Design a protein around this ligand. Structure first.
Ligand SMILES: N[C@@H](CCC(=O)O)C(=O)O
Length: 300
């Protein structure tokens, strides 16, 4: 009876990004429930395409799973419409959305602005001179940066990384002045004062960082789109497996230490149904097609 051995969990991004952070937090606690190890494998590269394509080829037995991200479910498909080696919707069985997650635009603290208003002013006075990091060329944070540029009338230079892990460290080091990130990986640095957050993408301000406005507060509600992290199995994985995993996710997401960690990092638990997640996946997918194809926001 499932599970009788270790479950591989593929994270399609480098260590120390939000995918990796949330993946390890939630599967650690799921594992305790399932009575089998869940072993995280980081497979970063190409905005999540490398790792997602690999997860898509796995046998549908439930022992090779992967972390859904907006990069892998929505933006990569839209960025590489002819040659992406997986269909996000047809090649995966959704299990559950772990968490809804805030995005953030942050700066190195030497950046000469203290708020979003002066942030825009500074960028407008220097078109083409500042650069920003992302988690990859066909990922949600590259699309975030490009969306920002279009909506605010700014010109800032994209520098992709193998995930936000290495991006956060370059932004903290000053090798890039700006970073577009999912909040959890930037959260420790912001708390420590090593980055300054300009805006978050979230329905409201977040208690961890109460003084950072949302993009809607900043006067750019089109930019106020969060992301999410969830669990995927290959298409054809039995419902027995899906419901077992989802149940363990639901238990894990009620754990008060997991609730706190999610809260503190800039996320909120979901633990919704496979179908509710599939609907979220389709929403993001459709939105990325809209944004990239209509609206003329170029990724490559
Ligand atoms: N950009 C990824 C996460 C990046 C990372 O985990 O390093 C996303 O779609 O959520």
């Amino acid at each position: 009876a499932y599970p009788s051995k270790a479950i591989r969990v593929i994270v399609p991004f480098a260590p120390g990004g939000s995918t990796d952070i949330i993946a390890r937090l939630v599967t650690q606690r799921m594992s305790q429930e399932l009575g089998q190890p869940m072993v995280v494998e980081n497979k970063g590269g190409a905005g999540g395409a490398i790792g997602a394509s690999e997860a898509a080829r796995a046998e549908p037995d439930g022992y090779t799973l992967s972390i859904a991200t907006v990069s892998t479910m929505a933006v990569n498909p839209a960025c590489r419409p002819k040659d992406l080696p997986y269909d996000p919707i047809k090649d995966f069985q959704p299990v559950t959305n772990f968490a809804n997650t805030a995005n953030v635009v942050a700066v190195n603290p030497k950046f000469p602005a203290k708020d979003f208003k002066g942030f825009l002013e500074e960028l407008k006075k220097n078109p083409g001179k500042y650069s920003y990091g992302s988690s990859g060329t066909c990922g949600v944070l590259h699309l975030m940066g490009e969306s920002f540029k279009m909506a605010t009338g700014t010109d800032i230079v994209h520098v992709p990384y193998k995930g936000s892990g290495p991006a956060v460290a370059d932004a903290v080091g000053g090798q890039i002045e700006l970073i577009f990130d999912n909040l959890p990986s930037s959260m420790p640095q912001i708390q420590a004062g090593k980055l300054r957050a300009m805006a978050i993408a979230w329905p409201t301000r977040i208690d961890a960082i109460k003084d950072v406005p949302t993009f809607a507060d900043a006067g750019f509600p089109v930019l106020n789109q969060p992301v999410w992290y969830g669990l995927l199995a290959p298409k054809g994985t039995p419902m027995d497996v899906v419901n077992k995993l989802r149940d363990a996710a639901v238990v894990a997401l009620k754990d008060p230490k997991v609730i706190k960690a999610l809260d503190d990092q800039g996320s909120a638990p979901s633990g919704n149904t496979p179908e509710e997640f599939a609907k979220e996946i389709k929403e993001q997918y459709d939105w990325a097609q809209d944004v990239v194809k209509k609206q003329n926001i170029k990724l490559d």
